[PDB]
């Protein structure tokens, strides 16, 4: 009982119109197999430009965030409806930068994901513990709590878990170059599988993709991709470089 | 010592690609005098589409929000650099929906504005009190506190106030249809002028535009626009309708 590999590239708050056009063009020009999901997430104002430049039949474009309300009086926010109207089907939710730096609570992330999922979108739901929480030996407690908030919102509607791609990114690995070792990563993904089996369904744990993120790059992704419970990567800085295409190849050849 | 009128249309989280194209086209097709600043603020993902559809030489496009950091690891956020790279020069900051519903603090709004201003952008800085604060007779205290946070960030760099357009929108008037009377609005703008004179400069208070927002529409904007300290309007719901063009005409003929 395995899985369709997944690699997402989160551009974060980076890029100019020319960078988006050129970089998306370079990615789209790369041979992308039909056996692996490849998604890139440019900043909101760059979405249209990225879509126009994406000449690939496999590459999909995603948003880095979405609000938990539909269209209405939510100045500065983006609705699921807007993303779907633009032809987008993927969206990142709960990235630790929003959780830890911008105050996005466990419940808000969960509500954003639920709304996106109910409308038919695929959600890259991020979870991860800080250096201090790990030092306090609370790694699994935290990751599970974040996943539980989502479980509370979906709960019964298990089927909605089908369009969820969990992205484990230890906060101490985000933008620090301090990537997790295959053992550290696999150990956490194992704990996440177990939680899914118990709180969701044994069958579902076998199908849901769980990707690793946090300093993942061309020279370290192969060893990570060889781990049974690591279905791919959520790439940050490296997704802005040509090595992102190499990571795609490595992921394909590995699983 | 007077001012160049200003009318901004905040679309908030509304619109589809077709709506943006058609609505922006209809606005752009309207005769816009060179004597009044007219700006519309579509949602972030619609910016490019709006720019493409804006065939007017006078109409300017603005963003509804911006982050307080430059390009970097800020997932889901937009930088000033991105907005300027797109040719945008206006941005709304501190809208009460973000302050009151999304937790944007007085200091965060102030820091966002300062960064935008330092880079050369024009900022529509929103302020406003809630029904309870007004009932508690704390209307001016609150509005002044929000303005003071900005004053703390700019403080000395007074000159930066040149590109600031203050938008007073009583929270109880936002999306409720309960517009402020000309007396209520003028009274607050008078108090804001006085604060500016004391904490900024007598000269500057004479030049800075202070616009009214909150249920402003085609049938009530004339009486508001006739008030000496009301230089224009920040239009919400009405900016999504053809009456927005009427408001432009009314503002022009009035001052």
XYZ file of C-alpha atoms in Angstrom:
510
model
C 0.000 0.000 0.000
C 2.002 2.933 -1.312
C 1.813 6.371 -2.893
C 2.076 8.887 -5.748
C 5.282 10.920 -5.025
C 4.857 14.653 -4.417
C 7.222 17.612 -4.667
C 6.163 21.176 -4.046
C 8.186 24.331 -4.451
C 7.264 27.179 -2.116
C 8.715 30.426 -3.501
C 7.597 32.248 -0.338
C 7.828 36.058 -0.574
C 10.354 36.121 -3.426
C 10.485 37.044 -7.080
C 9.813 39.765 -9.612
C 7.659 39.493 -12.720
C 10.730 38.683 -14.852
C 11.979 36.074 -12.371
C 8.591 34.349 -12.304
C 8.336 34.287 -16.092
C 11.871 32.931 -16.560
C 11.931 30.525 -13.625
C 8.501 29.067 -14.334
C 9.534 28.754 -17.992
C 12.716 26.884 -17.015
C 10.790 24.512 -14.749
C 8.087 23.954 -17.369
C 10.778 23.184 -19.953
C 11.987 20.323 -17.776
C 10.696 16.816 -18.477
C 8.136 16.059 -15.764
C 6.861 12.454 -15.527
C 3.141 11.747 -15.172
C 4.056 9.554 -12.201
C 4.930 12.405 -9.830
C 2.965 15.442 -8.663
C 4.966 18.639 -9.116
C 3.588 21.905 -7.779
C 5.122 25.362 -7.325
C 3.630 28.105 -5.169
C 4.450 31.663 -6.255
C 3.385 34.690 -4.225
C -0.263 35.739 -4.649
C 0.355 38.741 -6.933
C 2.412 36.481 -9.231
C -0.186 33.730 -9.698
C -1.569 34.998 -13.030
C 1.918 35.595 -14.393
C 2.978 32.080 -13.371
C -0.103 30.508 -14.953
C 0.554 32.351 -18.215
C 4.181 31.169 -18.230
C 3.384 27.539 -17.310
C 3.464 25.682 -20.628
C 3.835 22.306 -18.927
C 1.061 19.718 -18.964
C 2.246 18.275 -15.635
C 3.354 21.277 -13.579
C 0.598 22.692 -11.381
C 0.438 26.105 -9.718
C -0.533 26.608 -6.077
C -1.190 29.452 -3.656
C 0.842 29.960 -0.470
C -2.165 30.795 1.711
C -5.940 31.286 1.696
C -8.484 32.724 4.143
C -11.144 30.803 6.064
C -14.098 32.822 4.726
C -15.626 33.035 1.263
C -15.830 36.239 -0.763
C -16.720 39.201 1.436
C -15.413 42.046 3.595
C -11.983 40.544 4.306
C -9.530 43.224 3.183
C -6.166 41.805 2.157
C -7.395 38.205 2.183
C -7.874 35.646 -0.619
C -10.827 33.259 -0.859
C -10.905 29.670 -2.085
C -13.408 30.854 -4.696
C -10.844 33.275 -6.131
C -8.216 30.538 -6.395
C -10.588 28.101 -8.091
C -11.898 30.814 -10.426
C -8.265 31.168 -11.533
C -8.061 27.441 -12.244
C -5.943 26.607 -9.199
C -6.441 23.359 -7.319
C -3.580 23.404 -4.789
C -2.921 25.615 -1.759
C -0.435 25.613 1.127
C -1.948 25.964 4.603
C -0.413 26.348 8.052
C 3.161 26.989 6.956
C 5.172 27.434 10.163
C 6.185 30.943 9.129
C 2.510 31.907 9.378
C 1.956 29.810 12.520
C 5.078 30.924 14.403
C 5.691 34.432 13.063
C 2.232 35.666 12.089
C 0.106 34.157 14.846
C -1.922 31.712 12.759
C -3.438 29.417 15.394
C -3.879 25.649 15.107
C -7.636 26.116 14.666
C -7.352 28.840 12.009
C -5.036 26.674 9.919
C -7.476 23.792 10.405
C -10.481 25.887 9.361
C -8.680 27.210 6.278
C -7.808 23.672 5.210
C -11.320 22.358 5.825
C -12.920 25.082 3.725
C -10.425 24.502 0.913
C -10.910 20.727 1.058
C -14.719 20.903 1.105
C -14.600 22.936 -2.093
C -12.425 20.385 -3.873
C -8.896 21.763 -3.461
C -5.782 19.784 -2.524
C -4.153 21.092 0.655
C -0.485 20.951 1.597
C -0.993 21.087 5.382
C 2.212 21.989 7.211
C 3.162 20.876 10.720
C 6.394 21.052 12.704
C 8.003 21.589 16.095
C 10.500 24.226 17.218
C 14.004 23.614 18.520
C 12.830 24.232 22.092
C 9.847 21.902 21.798
C 12.152 19.160 20.492
C 14.623 19.884 23.281
C 11.697 19.608 25.694
C 10.987 16.219 24.103
C 7.615 17.474 22.832
C 8.186 16.865 19.125
C 5.342 14.403 18.571
C 2.974 16.123 20.998
C 3.120 19.370 19.020
C 2.947 17.875 15.531
C 0.029 15.710 16.642
C -1.764 18.674 18.231
C -1.559 20.608 14.957
C -2.849 17.577 13.063
C -5.580 17.062 15.683
C -6.922 20.570 15.174
C -7.456 19.596 11.530
C -8.871 16.269 12.641
C -11.391 18.144 14.764
C -12.582 20.193 11.786
C -12.708 17.274 9.347
C -13.220 14.560 11.929
C -16.007 12.493 10.461
C -15.663 13.726 6.872
C -12.587 11.473 6.602
C -12.907 11.334 2.811
C -11.689 14.937 2.783
C -8.327 13.586 3.969
C -7.904 12.231 0.446
C -6.900 15.664 -0.853
C -4.565 16.389 2.045
C -0.807 16.274 1.652
C 0.903 16.579 5.026
C 4.183 18.478 4.996
C 6.419 17.911 8.001
C 8.903 20.763 8.329
C 10.766 20.956 11.630
C 10.933 24.673 12.360
C 14.637 24.443 13.220
C 15.196 23.202 9.649
C 13.318 26.038 7.937
C 15.733 28.355 6.130
C 18.572 27.393 8.476
C 20.373 24.844 6.324
C 20.030 22.436 9.247
C 18.166 19.649 7.469
C 16.850 16.697 9.461
C 18.716 13.421 9.074
C 16.847 10.612 7.313
C 16.433 8.947 10.721
C 15.040 12.047 12.406
C 12.610 12.693 9.556
C 11.492 9.067 9.106
C 11.004 8.748 12.865
C 8.526 11.632 12.848
C 6.738 10.467 9.698
C 6.401 7.068 11.381
C 4.750 8.750 14.363
C 2.436 10.634 12.009
C 1.460 7.410 10.215
C 0.578 5.868 13.570
C -1.552 8.865 14.529
C -3.376 8.698 11.202
C -3.993 4.952 11.615
C -5.503 5.526 15.051
C -7.411 8.793 14.595
C -8.356 8.485 10.925
C -8.115 5.055 9.306
C -5.572 2.297 8.721
C -6.522 2.390 5.036
C -6.062 6.149 4.816
C -2.626 6.130 6.452
C -1.521 3.860 3.635
C -2.545 6.401 0.993
C -2.004 9.911 2.353
C 1.242 11.540 1.213
C 3.536 12.883 3.929
C 6.357 15.015 2.580
C 9.437 16.420 4.286
C 10.405 20.080 4.188
C 13.083 22.229 5.778
C 16.432 22.774 4.069
C 15.671 20.039 1.535
C 17.880 20.366 -1.551
C 19.525 18.599 -4.477
C 22.367 17.073 -2.455
C 20.342 15.707 0.466
C 16.917 14.837 -0.970
C 17.898 11.402 -2.293
C 18.657 9.927 1.142
C 15.427 11.433 2.469
C 13.392 10.211 -0.487
C 14.611 6.660 0.147
C 12.774 6.608 3.477
C 9.516 4.600 3.234
C 7.302 7.245 4.850
C 8.759 10.254 3.032
C 6.702 10.667 -0.141
C 8.448 13.771 -1.378
C 9.480 17.254 -0.360
C 8.187 20.753 0.245
C 11.098 22.793 -1.101
C 11.767 26.345 0.014
C 14.929 28.134 -1.059
C 16.011 25.391 -3.449
C 12.745 25.752 -5.398
C 13.936 29.142 -6.623
C 16.989 27.525 -8.246
C 17.712 25.152 -11.158
C 18.396 22.388 -8.628
C 14.624 22.150 -8.118
C 14.467 20.284 -11.444
C 17.205 17.930 -10.240
C 15.155 17.218 -7.108
C 12.231 16.287 -9.351
C 14.429 13.762 -11.196
C 15.855 12.375 -7.957
C 12.372 11.928 -6.505
C 11.179 10.159 -9.648
C 14.119 7.755 -9.843
C 13.959 7.037 -6.116
C 10.315 6.006 -5.708
C -4.425 75.903 2.395
C -6.354 73.066 0.794
C -6.081 69.740 -0.998
C -6.197 67.418 -4.022
C -9.432 65.347 -3.596
C -9.032 61.581 -3.215
C -11.376 58.650 -3.777
C -10.343 55.050 -3.340
C -12.338 51.932 -4.053
C -11.529 48.935 -1.867
C -12.905 45.788 -3.534
C -11.943 43.760 -0.446
C -12.155 39.975 -0.944
C -14.536 40.103 -3.917
C -14.483 39.424 -7.626
C -13.681 36.874 -10.294
C -11.375 37.347 -13.267
C -14.337 38.301 -15.491
C -15.713 40.743 -12.909
C -12.334 42.454 -12.559
C -11.891 42.766 -16.317
C -15.401 44.155 -16.871
C -15.611 46.363 -13.790
C -12.153 47.859 -14.230
C -13.002 48.414 -17.906
C -16.232 50.220 -16.968
C -14.426 52.434 -14.457
C -11.596 53.160 -16.897
C -14.156 54.103 -19.556
C -15.476 56.816 -17.257
C -14.158 60.360 -17.661
C -11.738 60.932 -14.779
C -10.482 64.511 -14.242
C -6.786 65.188 -13.656
C -7.852 67.181 -10.596
C -8.838 64.182 -8.465
C -6.929 61.071 -7.404
C -8.900 57.914 -8.166
C -7.584 54.565 -6.980
C -9.133 51.088 -6.832
C -7.747 48.206 -4.790
C -8.506 44.729 -6.147
C -7.538 41.572 -4.271
C -3.872 40.549 -4.580
C -4.370 37.704 -7.086
C -6.313 40.114 -9.329
C -3.699 42.886 -9.484
C -2.150 41.838 -12.819
C -5.564 41.338 -14.391
C -6.679 44.779 -13.193
C -3.526 46.447 -14.512
C -4.016 44.824 -17.917
C -7.640 46.011 -18.036
C -6.896 49.570 -16.840
C -6.813 51.643 -20.028
C -7.275 54.899 -18.128
C -4.506 57.480 -17.857
C -5.858 58.703 -14.502
C -7.062 55.573 -12.707
C -4.418 54.012 -10.473
C -4.335 50.496 -9.032
C -3.546 49.753 -5.388
C -3.005 46.754 -3.131
C -5.194 46.041 -0.090
C -2.297 45.059 2.179
C 1.475 44.564 2.320
C 3.895 42.963 4.790
C 6.453 44.749 6.964
C 9.474 42.818 5.645
C 11.173 42.831 2.256
C 11.483 39.767 0.036
C 12.267 36.666 2.077
C 10.859 33.687 3.976
C 7.395 35.144 4.612
C 5.005 32.548 3.194
C 1.694 34.037 2.097
C 2.915 37.625 2.422
C 3.528 40.363 -0.179
C 6.486 42.755 -0.113
C 6.620 46.417 -1.095
C 9.251 45.404 -3.649
C 6.766 43.087 -5.367
C 4.150 45.839 -5.581
C 6.600 48.379 -6.992
C 8.029 45.824 -9.432
C 4.456 45.549 -10.740
C 4.282 49.316 -11.213
C 2.013 49.951 -8.229
C 2.411 53.067 -6.117
C -0.572 52.860 -3.741
C -1.378 50.455 -0.900
C -4.005 50.271 1.852
C -2.666 49.690 5.368
C -4.371 49.081 8.703
C -7.885 48.520 7.391
C -10.053 47.868 10.457
C -11.007 44.436 9.145
C -7.347 43.452 9.513
C -6.954 45.336 12.810
C -10.165 44.106 14.457
C -10.704 40.695 12.860
C -7.199 39.522 11.980
C -5.215 40.842 14.934
C -3.090 43.416 13.116
C -1.711 45.531 15.969
C -1.262 49.308 15.954
C 2.512 48.865 15.671
C 2.366 46.323 12.829
C 0.154 48.626 10.773
C 2.561 51.464 11.569
C 5.618 49.438 10.541
C 3.975 48.325 7.291
C 3.152 51.927 6.417
C 6.627 53.192 7.291
C 8.335 50.609 5.099
C 5.982 51.377 2.210
C 6.452 55.134 2.628
C 10.254 54.949 2.853
C 10.299 53.131 -0.474
C 8.211 55.798 -2.188
C 4.668 54.401 -2.045
C 1.509 56.319 -1.136
C -0.276 54.807 1.864
C -3.986 54.892 2.630
C -3.668 54.506 6.419
C -6.958 53.491 8.021
C -8.084 54.371 11.544
C -11.411 54.070 13.349
C -13.185 53.314 16.612
C -15.731 50.612 17.434
C -19.297 51.143 18.597
C -18.302 50.289 22.174
C -15.311 52.628 22.184
C -17.553 55.454 20.948
C -20.159 54.552 23.556
C -17.358 54.663 26.125
C -16.574 58.149 24.798
C -13.142 56.975 23.617
C -13.528 57.828 19.935
C -10.663 60.316 19.687
C -8.417 58.436 22.110
C -8.458 55.327 19.918
C -8.114 57.049 16.548
C -5.259 59.131 17.943
C -3.542 56.066 19.420
C -3.581 54.351 16.020
C -2.203 57.499 14.397
C 0.394 57.836 17.178
C 1.765 54.366 16.506
C 2.478 55.578 12.966
C 3.831 58.822 14.363
C 6.245 56.807 16.481
C 7.586 54.957 13.438
C 7.829 58.030 11.206
C 8.207 60.567 13.984
C 11.060 62.722 12.796
C 10.898 61.728 9.121
C 7.835 64.000 8.846
C 8.344 64.387 5.094
C 7.135 60.796 4.768
C 3.716 62.072 5.870
C 3.467 63.656 2.428
C 2.535 60.318 0.857
C 0.060 59.408 3.581
C -3.675 59.555 3.009
C -5.550 59.031 6.266
C -8.822 57.144 5.948
C -11.206 57.515 8.868
C -13.698 54.652 8.883
C -15.724 54.244 12.067
C -15.920 50.488 12.541
C -19.663 50.667 13.229
C -20.045 52.141 9.724
C -18.080 49.420 7.924
C -20.397 47.232 5.851
C -23.352 48.042 8.109
C -25.048 50.730 6.043
C -24.855 52.940 9.132
C -22.909 55.835 7.637
C -21.698 58.647 9.882
C -23.549 61.945 9.619
C -21.599 64.860 8.143
C -21.358 66.296 11.669
C -20.046 63.089 13.214
C -17.475 62.629 10.452
C -16.342 66.275 10.299
C -16.043 66.344 14.091
C -13.562 63.464 14.007
C -11.621 64.831 11.034
C -11.374 68.111 12.952
C -9.871 66.233 15.895
C -7.440 64.505 13.540
C -6.381 67.839 12.014
C -5.670 69.155 15.503
C -3.586 66.097 16.368
C -1.598 66.481 13.154
C -1.009 70.190 13.843
C 0.330 69.388 17.305
C 2.263 66.155 16.731
C 3.390 66.703 13.140
C 3.224 70.233 11.741
C 0.708 73.027 11.213
C 1.842 73.176 7.582
C 1.400 69.440 7.091
C -2.114 69.358 8.552
C -3.081 71.809 5.840
C -1.922 69.447 3.090
C -2.524 65.856 4.187
C -5.708 64.311 2.781
C -8.132 62.795 5.285
C -10.879 60.761 3.660
C -14.038 59.253 5.113
C -14.993 55.608 4.726
C -17.744 53.363 6.035
C -21.002 52.938 4.129
C -20.121 55.833 1.822
C -22.172 55.713 -1.385
C -23.672 57.672 -4.267
C -26.613 59.067 -2.293
C -24.739 60.233 0.810
C -21.248 61.190 -0.394
C -22.168 64.706 -1.535
C -23.100 65.953 1.948
C -19.937 64.358 3.333
C -17.759 65.769 0.568
C -19.014 69.272 1.373
C -17.346 69.101 4.787
C -14.083 71.116 4.840
C -11.948 68.367 6.387
C -13.307 65.486 4.303
C -11.094 65.280 1.217
C -12.771 62.267 -0.307
C -13.846 58.726 0.426
C -12.580 55.192 0.863
C -15.417 53.250 -0.758
C -16.134 49.634 0.085
C -19.237 47.925 -1.260
C -20.203 50.821 -3.514
C -16.842 50.585 -5.318
C -17.965 47.284 -6.822
C -20.936 49.010 -8.485
C -21.516 51.571 -11.266
C -22.331 54.163 -8.596
C -18.589 54.361 -7.885
C -18.270 56.441 -11.069
C -21.068 58.715 -9.850
C -19.179 59.216 -6.579
C -16.147 60.289 -8.608
C -18.254 62.933 -10.390
C -19.843 64.106 -7.141
C -16.437 64.450 -5.491
C -15.092 66.421 -8.447
C -18.022 68.838 -8.630
C -18.050 69.308 -4.860
C -14.432 70.304 -4.204
